[PDB]
Design an enzyme around this catalytic site. Structure first.
Site, PDB file in Angstrom:
ATOM      1  N   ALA A 262      34.866  44.856  32.295  1.00 18.69           N
ATOM      2  CA  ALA A 262      34.200  45.503  31.446  1.00 18.69           C
ATOM      3  C   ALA A 262      34.624  47.247  32.419  1.00 18.69           C
ATOM      4  O   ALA A 262      33.182  48.071  32.004  1.00 18.69           O
ATOM      5  CB  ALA A 262      33.211  45.623  32.978  1.00 18.69           C
ATOM      6  N   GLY A 263      35.650  47.502  33.312  1.00 14.19           N
ATOM      7  CA  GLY A 263      36.069  48.862  33.256  1.00 14.19           C
ATOM      8  C   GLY A 263      35.385  49.245  34.431  1.00 14.19           C
ATOM      9  O   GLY A 263      35.460  50.658  34.526  1.00 14.19           O
TER      10      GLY A 263
ATOM     11  N   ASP B 147      40.745  38.058  43.329  1.00 16.37           N
ATOM     12  CA  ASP B 147      38.947  37.832  42.667  1.00 16.37           C
ATOM     13  C   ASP B 147      38.150  37.109  44.226  1.00 16.37           C
ATOM     14  O   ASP B 147      36.942  38.145  43.931  1.00 16.37           O
ATOM     15  CB  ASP B 147      38.550  37.531  40.878  1.00 16.37           C
ATOM     16  CG  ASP B 147      38.805  38.292  40.500  1.00 16.37           C
ATOM     17  OD1 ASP B 147      39.664  38.748  39.609  1.00 16.37           O
ATOM     18  OD2 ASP B 147      37.561  38.831  39.696  1.00 16.37           O
TER      19      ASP B 147
ATOM     20  N   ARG C 186      37.630  45.715  39.627  1.00 21.38           N
ATOM     21  CA  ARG C 186      38.473  46.205  39.491  1.00 21.38           C
ATOM     22  C   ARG C 186      39.567  47.077  38.851  1.00 21.38           C
ATOM     23  O   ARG C 186      40.285  48.478  39.993  1.00 21.38           O
ATOM     24  CB  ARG C 186      39.219  44.847  38.728  1.00 21.38           C
ATOM     25  CG  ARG C 186      39.712  44.020  39.060  1.00 21.38           C
ATOM     26  CD  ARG C 186      39.528  42.614  36.735  1.00 21.38           C
ATOM     27  NE  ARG C 186      39.885  41.652  37.913  1.00 21.38           N
ATOM     28  CZ  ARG C 186      40.144  40.383  37.418  1.00 21.38           C
ATOM     29  NH1 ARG C 186      41.111  40.868  36.630  1.00 21.38           N
ATOM     30  NH2 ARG C 186      39.999  39.188  37.734  1.00 21.38           N
TER      31      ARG C 186
ATOM     32  N   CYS D  30      39.597  47.180  33.454  1.00 20.97           N
ATOM     33  CA  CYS D  30      39.873  46.363  33.342  1.00 20.97           C
ATOM     34  C   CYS D  30      39.585  45.576  32.365  1.00 20.97           C
ATOM     35  O   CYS D  30      39.451  45.556  31.078  1.00 20.97           O
ATOM     36  CB  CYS D  30      38.876  45.678  35.355  1.00 20.97           C
ATOM     37  SG  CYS D  30      37.984  46.072  35.170  1.00 20.97           S
TER      38      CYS D  30
ATOM     39  N   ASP E 219      24.742  45.353  29.661  1.00 16.93           N
ATOM     40  CA  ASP E 219      24.884  45.979  30.968  1.00 16.93           C
ATOM     41  C   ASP E 219      25.290  47.056  31.576  1.00 16.93           C
ATOM     42  O   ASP E 219      25.032  47.576  32.731  1.00 16.93           O
ATOM     43  CB  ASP E 219      24.337  45.146  32.247  1.00 16.93           C
ATOM     44  CG  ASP E 219      25.387  43.763  32.488  1.00 16.93           C
ATOM     45  OD1 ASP E 219      25.710  43.397  31.143  1.00 16.93           O
ATOM     46  OD2 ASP E 219      25.581  43.589  33.127  1.00 16.93           O
TER      47      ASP E 219
END
Lengths: 293, 284, 296, 286
Positions: free
Chosen positions: B218-219, B189, B222, B216, B58
């Site tokens: 998923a890019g 987080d 963060r 991070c 996703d």
């Protein structure tokens, strides 16, 4: 009308060749005056060269007597991992249509090839005119910053430069280069004039052909010799006048002394010797003659 | 109208602002309405052969801003990664996923073709009993790990507060390259150290003339938070904070370059606070 | 009588220019025969190239098709710490007075510049004629083995080579080099022709180079070294002309003067000495020019 | 005619010959006569300037055959080193025979190795012998940091232990060019063969030819140096099949003594050369 103006210039130049009662012709004398004018400007501190003479930048100048004017110097705002100084020994020169028609610059040193390319990239330069050889009279004049045609590409990280074609004309080559930087690439044309006559057919040829590659003045053309004045300046002066001409716009009060004098306020010693000063005059005279059917 | 005024208002509102949760939901809602009229497609990313190069089904890279690779002995232009514009450079940042075993190669294809020198990693190789990222560097002292045609070797480390700094080298055809991996191993987080890291990182490269690679797992998240803060700080230093400056719009804009740039209301809230800190820290 | 002989060649060369019923002039046809003759000699094993084709020498050859005839190959007896093989891609070519007037050789590879220098030294060479550029048609033709004028001296241990002067003439340069070995020194003159012309009278710069080079070395007591990329074609072209010019200067053009024969004989000493029909024609026209110059 | 036969006479004559001492006296007498009668001058060597570059005020290098140094330094400018070229079987510079360098000449020494592209160094003495200094150590010991001698520099890189000698691999830099070398250090001269013959044949695996000189030296640069040359030179003549009909050690050494002063120095070395060469010959006759 143009014709009257052209003929006047030709006859003027013809007369300038005649020696003084002191054995000095007009080229010699006009040139002395140019040299006096430069001293005047320097000593009135009208055109300082403060940046170029900073202790950091001594290593970035090829000749300690040739420094870029502060007011017209090319600033490098594009940075690299290895070089982030804004200093290069180069200046903008105005053209027939306004500022920045030319960038006149020294032949790069081993430690400034990187700056050379930063400049070429940042200023979207397409055309490079080189008017010295890598070596002359037993001395090194310029770092070879272009790969030979058939050589593998050369790395000046973060730049990549490749030669994809070469072409020989009488006294010069035209190298087609590809400059790459971070996924982008630009095709450049380097006109390498390798035969200087300290009559002018090969130079006029080069200039018109070069102007077929870049007709406009929307990005500056880069011109360098060893010091970035002398030949550099002779080439600008002829290119400039040729544009005037072709635009059919030679102004009534056309005065080459004034063109060079002004050029000399934008790039130190733009035209550097009386021999070059005569060259510019004779070459234009020839231009004018041709156009005069 | 003036830097100092503009700043103090901000610290003002970001002292009030759960309206964070609510503003964030407004973002997520605008986002979805952007994945409906499909103003920003991700065709390339959801092609057959690329499913394998995606860490999450996703999280696909926007077509318009995606990073293309062209640098091997095997040869795709695809990697899950997008450019994010900085104050002046359209390629100030690359935001990408943590590489998979089969993509680590495209990873260096990218680090190399784009002349990158700074890598900012903001996750741990393993988090919560789950793999998050293929360790793509040699441990301090370990031998040079290879990834033909790329060879890469550590060369130093240093323990700042909540993060590490690794001088790496990266060869490929007898050319070299020294890199610096900043590895924040401790994200909140559910600041100082983040603010400290970004400023130190900006001692290594102040400019945006080559991309800084951030990632991070998923890019985004963060990753987004960090880009947002660094971007604002640069705007701060240049004295260019605009009058109606506003995190909401900052993140929205960023979210049109990297899918879901900032991922959680917790990150969103953290962005407000680090920035407010910076702003007040600037009024002595 | 020389005048009669000279005029006959000129008229002959003029007639060779006209194409036959199949469109091929005498140059094209003579040249076919030269190729037929070379393959005859190969297959009768009259001129083996066994040494150049040993496994170990493959890396020492620029082109896999250009090999030195065993019988005339130049042997390197001078050894160095890095290289002790006797093999170099090069042959001797006879001159007007006997063997070893010329050494025909390929443009050195990166790994054989050292062999090039061993050869130049061992054989007391003074004159070097280079007739290719370092790159041409976008391909690399020759390793640069000379320092540029003003460049720092170059080292290929145990040799050191310096450039002390360069001179520009029309289509070539004259570099004065110093070759040093082990505390000894020799001055060399490199004639670098950079403007080859397939054909066109015409050829003025080639003739210039040759006669001027012959003022630097009048005699034939040590060989002149000549190379292009492969060490044939232009190389052979230049030998044939230099060879004829000496004959001519000696006032010695034989009655039975036959350029086909001169070149054919050369092709049994250096593989493919003159390599194309264009070069074949070139040699004829250049000599024709010499001949009429002398006739006034 | 016929090597094998020529080879025979020799082994004969040698096993028959004391007569060595007498022959040597004839050599020394012939030598004396060859300096009187100044047939080979050493003017350069005797000059005041170079008195300090000579280990012995008695051993001077013949002017005609002396190795001139012209690799100007920063800056020792003299072209003087106490050393002579000795002819090989085909090369006029197959060997350099020099004295073990002094502290102040270790630099010229490397100037020499460098300007003459040397690669093999043969050392046939120890730094200290018999309570006296014989030779400046010009090399770094196995392990030690690179020693230096501006504008030179020289480290080590391995060492090996053959019978009575060592084999030391070294590098040597000068304006970051660089060179590998092989010093053979014979540390056991009996004066007073296998081990000598062994060392020479190993050295000739490292460098078969005579196109760069081999540098040989003891302390004075003659004696052990000359003997080793005589043996190596004879062996190479042996291997080439060139042993001449009238071959003899007396004339071999005489000829050598016109190239390097007092080449073979003691009757014991003279006798050694004879017996090593005989051994070599009886070997060639399977």
């Amino acid at each position: 009308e143009q014709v009257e103006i052209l003929r006047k210039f030709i006859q003027r130049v013809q007369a300038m060749k005649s020696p003084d009662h002191n054995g000095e012709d007009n080229f010699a004398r006009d040139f002395m005056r140019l040299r006096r004018l430069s001293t005047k400007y320097r000593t009135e501190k009208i055109y300082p060269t403060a940046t170029g003479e900073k202790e950091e930048n001594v290593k970035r100048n090829r000749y300690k007597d040739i420094l870029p004017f502060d007011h017209s110097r090319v600033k490098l705002t594009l940075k690299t991992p290895s070089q982030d100084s804004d200093y290069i020994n180069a200046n903008f020169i105005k053209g027939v249509y306004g500022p920045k028609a030319y960038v006149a610059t020294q032949g790069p040193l081993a430690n400034t090839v990187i700056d050379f390319w930063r400049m070429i990239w940042e200023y979207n330069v397409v055309i490079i005119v080189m008017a010295c050889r890598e070596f002359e009279m037993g001395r090194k004049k310029c770092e070879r910053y272009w790969p030979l045609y058939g050589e593998d590409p050369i790395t000046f990280a973060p730049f990549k430069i490749s030669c994809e074609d070469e072409q020989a004309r009488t006294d010069y080559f035209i190298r087609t280069l590809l400059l790459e930087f971070q996924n982008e690439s630009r095709r450049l044309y380097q006109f390498h004039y390798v035969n200087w006559p300290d009559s002018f057919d090969s130079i006029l040829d080069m200039i018109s052909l070069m102007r077929k590659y870049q007709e406009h003045e929307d990005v500056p053309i880069c011109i360098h010799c060893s010091a970035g004045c002398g030949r550099t300046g002779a080439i600008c002066a002829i290119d400039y006048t040729w544009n005037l001409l072709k635009a059919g716009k030679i102004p009534e009060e056309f005065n080459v002394f004034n063109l060079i004098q002004e050029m000399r306020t934008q790039r130190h010693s733009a035209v550097q010797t009386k021999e070059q000063y005569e060259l510019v005059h004779r070459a234009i005279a020839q231009l004018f003659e041709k156009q005069l059917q």
